[model samples]
Target: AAQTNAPWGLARISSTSPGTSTYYYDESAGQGSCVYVIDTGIEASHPEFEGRAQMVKTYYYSSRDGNGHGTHCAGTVGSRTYGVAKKTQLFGVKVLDDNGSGQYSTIIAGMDFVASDKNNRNCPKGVVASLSLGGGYSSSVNSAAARLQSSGVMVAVAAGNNNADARNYSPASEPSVCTVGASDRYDRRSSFSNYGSVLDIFGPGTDILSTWIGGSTRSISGTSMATPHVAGLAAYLMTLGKTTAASACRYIADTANKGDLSNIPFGTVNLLAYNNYQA
Candidate 1:
């Protein structure tokens, strides 16, 4: 049997008790769910992925990640080492170009592709969209997220890296999506994380290590990194037959580590604390 190394975020969330071994990173964690990384793309050949990654859609360039950001996020969502859901199928939907810049139309196109079974026929269980990109508010993108949620697709988006309220961002402010903010290992909100009533949860993001482009691994920070942790969790829950976005969201909200985050408005929200995998 292969030993799994739980990433810092996963350790925080999956620990059965403080410093305990009974956790959720076992081999049987996420077997039949799919997680879509809607970003630059993913280096599917990365060894950490164990050959489970698939490129389902490309809006601009090749599905291969030239910018590294997508690959890092993808690994956190499903790679063997850094992933929360190690056995889930990973998909890359390239909306951003090599420069990590993308238009709203490209993002919506990728979202539609994930939601449509005609485009992604392999993932019959369910799909979770993990988006790390954001611009100003876009009504079209928000509406698309809502529609996807209606179709039983779980959407997890990043609260922007800027130190402002998350309501200023498009997908983060989108009510239907699960908006995640960055947190340090100590469970404190990262200095650059955007927060507000719109933000749903927090995840470890600062100096977090994960697979990168060129079959390497590196440490990076941002709410972009935080979003995938929540996405991966949603995917794992889907494998247990909690398929609806609303059900997944409610489970996460109810199971999260409740705390007082002094920096955020309301100062209290559900932190990403996964004590068990029963639900």
Candidate 2:
């Protein structure tokens, strides 16, 4: 984990409590929408996310069992913020197994399952899919992702944990996808962030406190943590009547305090700009 928890100094904008506006919320409250967590497998029965896990689909690329990363990520994106949006559903699609790694083909297979459900009346419409894993840019993955995007599913991915560059990661390196960079308390790029012009936007990712395995809470830091801030924000933005993922990305990008591209160092998150731009 990173030494600091306030990625890019976002904590200075406001505390981590819900409804501070700094944490990303829709004035109307999140309603009439659902978010999908495509990662390892969720615990499903964990107290923090009990009854909130909606199993739309599940896939396994490994024979392992009980990895906590996926479950923790799920709780961050849609877990009840002390009973807020308790009814909003979280669909878990387990592509990666307990080892925290999976074959690209397996991930594509899981995505295809979702895409095939487009006309299945039983599926929910306007769903936002959040992914907290990434390698480097892969055309095969991007092709699959493009299909999902075309089918009306918005995908979000972690920019990767590398501190040097953003080009080193997949899914995150894809131009069409939302590439999220991590920021700490000062709103400067996290020491571990992989930043570049291709980076879509920024969010809190340093030392985030969220639900972990076995009904516990701890502070974990990584681009993985920041990925969900955008996920939650996507859900919040959707509540504001911005239904599509592209709209949500545009809203956040336009609002982010575009950092000093010239200096190429000490990037800023523009939390104040991002929040106010949402209005």
The TM-score between candidate 2 and the true structure equals 0.80
lDDT of 1 by residue, 62-137 (tens): 7778999999999989888888888999988899998999999888887787788524456655778898989898
Give one digit per residue, the lDDT tens place, for model 2 in 104-171: 88788777766665445232325667778877668888777767766776677787888766776677
Error of 2 at 93 (Å): 0.7
Regions more than 4 Å wrong, model 1: 1-5, 16-23, 260-262, 273-275
TM-score: model 1 vs. ground truth: 0.91
Clashes of each: 1, 16
The per-residue C-alpha lDDT of model 2 at residue 175 equals 72
RMSD of each: 2.6, 5.4
